[PDB]
From Swiss-Prot, chain A:
It comes from Escherichia coli (strain K12). The lineage of its organism: Bacteria, Pseudomonadati, Pseudomonadota, Gammaproteobacteria, Enterobacterales. Changing residue 179 to A/L: The catalytic efficiency is not increased, when the sodium concentration increases. Belongs to the glycosyl hydrolase 2 family. Homotetramer. Induction: By allolactose. Transmembrane segments: none annotated. The record marks 381 as: Important for ensuring that an appropriate proportion of lactose is converted to allolactose. Substrate binds at residue 381. The chain holds residues 620 to 1024 of 1024 of the full protein. This is Beta-galactosidase.
């Protein structure tokens, strides 16, 4: 993020014209090459290289050729980057010094899904709702109101039920100088603890299941109360269609007098451990709502080890924002969300003092958030999350689609 | 457009696309849930293309057959207010005659909006949610085509515009775009819910 904000080349896009302004005061851009690329949802469509001839503090206007205009659905992204072909005393040949990304043109998807002939079958007991479709099967706990288990064939997919999460392992900016002796009431973590966000217990309000003409509809409503006070209300809809897909719509109400929650999303512990994490979204590196400018939208494939940031004092980490599709093993999650995936739960990160004491858990912990609070950074002893990055709207909606390899 | 009977309600699902010259501008997915108590829950999800200019509003409109004398709502301000001109407004229960819900600007335009409204009552109809509304006898089409306010004529019924989201108004100057980025509808995806009930 520091490298991107400190670039010596600034970029402006106007139609098909890229304006490059040099921030150098003395040198001419004699070791600079501009590589541009246009991709559609991570699929490259066109590319080109233009040498840079910019005087100190000057501007070079670069007219792109006729860019591709795909009729397939998706967003067009234009990425430029400055490459140094020759090695310097402080850098090697091929060094990238500056980059920028834009959205070019989006074709909204209007095509309907294929008319699947099958219908998921719903069985009702006193303890659970069971939806069965082919080899796949879902189970909803009627006492808890959460999806408890999913089976592909005879293999369980979950170790922990899929539940709403409103907290994160506190960052160093969340803690401040709030020691166990000199408590800091203004610290974010102290306000969350005093409000009971870490101790709030979910209470089921309603849970119904209806069979549609082509799907199965599951509706749940939970209330998170702490000492006779409702902090959050979550209303969730599960739509299991005949194609195997699972659409999850979540509507959340947050009390205005409680401190703004750190996140609004779901979490679960997947039984499967996989080697690669593939997602279509922002950046190869971890990024957050107020630290995502350096990240780029593309198709990224990383090993699961690179999805975890080894901070000395464990905390919430590894978040990727602006993600439209996430693939892990046989599971695919689509929507507009942020996620982090690792072998350590948020509970373990909160209780472990140093990273060398962290131990991997049995499965994979996945946190998918519709919304996430920004991180601080102006200082580390006082609250420094700006108002535009706090979760203060009061009402929140997000949708998720969960499908499999079929 | 599908209709399903639930255990206690009737579910209506629709999806529309707004296209102009071979290009989809907006997609609206709407859900209607008519329960046994008489209530009508309407959930709207809207997709806006990123390359099209940001829309001025995202909501619904209809012409009610009934004309009533008083407009009662629980929301912001007695006077008209907009996303970037609502600081002076106050949240309370307001009751105004329908005439005061229209602002007589010399050159007709969109007017009379009330923001931050949780409940709106007009005749036997009640609308609940988190929305902005304007109510008057002139349609948005008539306001666009009428040069001066003295040429405005009331229509047969009442025109109601309920918006989940609304673009801010300018004011820094009148010759150049002056709506700030935080008041433009640039999110791309929008959701809002409405409940429509009656006197029962």
């Amino acid at each position: 993020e520091a490298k991107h904000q400190q670039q010596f080349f600034q970029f402006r896009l106007s139609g098909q014209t890229i304006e490059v302004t040099s921030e150098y005061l003395f040198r001419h851009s004699d070791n600079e090459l501009l590589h541009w690329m246009v991709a559609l949802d991570g699929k490259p469509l066109a590319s080109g290289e233009v040498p840079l001839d910019v005087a100190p503090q000057g501007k070079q206007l670069i007219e792109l050729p006729e860019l591709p205009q795909p009729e397939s659905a998706g967003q067009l992204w234009l990425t430029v980057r400055v490459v140094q072909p020759n090695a310097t005393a402080w850098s090697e040949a091929g060094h990238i010094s500056a980059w920028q990304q834009w959205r070019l043109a989006e074709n909204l998807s209007v095509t309907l899904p294929a008319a699947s002939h099958a219908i998921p079958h719903l069985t009702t007991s006193e303890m659970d709702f069971c939806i069965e479709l082919g080899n796949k099967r879902w189970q909803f706990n009627r006492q808890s109101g959460f999806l408890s288990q999913m089976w592909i064939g005879d293999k369980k997919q979950l170790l922990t039920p899929l539940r709403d999460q409103f907290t994160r392992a506190p960052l160093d900016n969340d803690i401040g100088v709030s020691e166990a002796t000199r408590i800091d009431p203004n610290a974010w973590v102290e306000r969350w603890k005093a409000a009971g966000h870490y101790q709030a217990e979910a209470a089921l309000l309603q849970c119904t299941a209806d069979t549609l003409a082509d799907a199965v509809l599951i509706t749940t409503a939970h209330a998170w109360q702490h000492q006779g006070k409702t902090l959050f209300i979550s209303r969730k809809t599960y739509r299991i269609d005949g194609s195997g897909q699972m659409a999850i719509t979540v509507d959340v109400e947050v009390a205005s007098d409680t401190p703004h929650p750190a996140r609004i999303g779901l979490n679960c512990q997947l039984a499967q451990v996989a080697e690669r994490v593939n997602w279509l979204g922002l950046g190869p590196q971890e990024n957050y709502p107020d630290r995502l400018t350096a990240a780029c939208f593309d198709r990224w494939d990383l090993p699961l080890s690179d999805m975890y940031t080894p901070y000395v004092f464990p905390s919430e980490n590894g978040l990727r924002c602006g993600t439209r599709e996430l693939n892990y093993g046989p599971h695919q999650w689509r929507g507009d969300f942020q996620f982090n995936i690792s072998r350590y739960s948020q509970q373990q990160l909160m209780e472990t003092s140093h990273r060398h004491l962290l131990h991997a858990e049995e499965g994979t912990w996945l946190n998918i958030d519709g919304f996430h609070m920004g991180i601080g950074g102006d200082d580390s002893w006082s609250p420094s999350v700006s108002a535009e990055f706090q979760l203060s709207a009061g009402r929140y909606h997000y949708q998720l689609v969960w499908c499999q390899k079929g």
